[PDB]
Design a protein around this ligand. Sequence first.
Ligand code: CAT
Length: 117
Amino acid sequence: KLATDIENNVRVVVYIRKDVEDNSQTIEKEGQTVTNNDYHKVYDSLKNMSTVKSVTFSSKEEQYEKLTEIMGDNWKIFEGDANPLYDAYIVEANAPNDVKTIAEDAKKIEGVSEVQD
Ligand SMILES: CCCCCCCCCCCC[N+](C)(C)C
């Protein structure tokens, strides 16, 4: 059994604003590698909810690889361009009934772009 395998009825997906790097520990400033003060701001608010069991980062890169894996071949015409997908956290609720509450509080976290239940 693996951690990234969560049942449909208890999964909430939390999409991160495209200009927030919640999973990046360091960023570039003045040519140096320095602390990202916004690191895990969204992660921690989700992890602090009493009804959530796990929160796992899913990058936009990873989401596109899996899409090409599940559907046919890569989507060649977009290969030169930026990835338009959103980084996301995959949140596991403690019970199905907690999902609607989790998704509502999640949209109120600053940095959260959208939440899918
Ligand atoms: C409105 C929704 C339409 C969006 C469809 C876009 C498909 C994403 C392809 C990204 C490939 C870029 N690449 C190679 C760097 C990962």
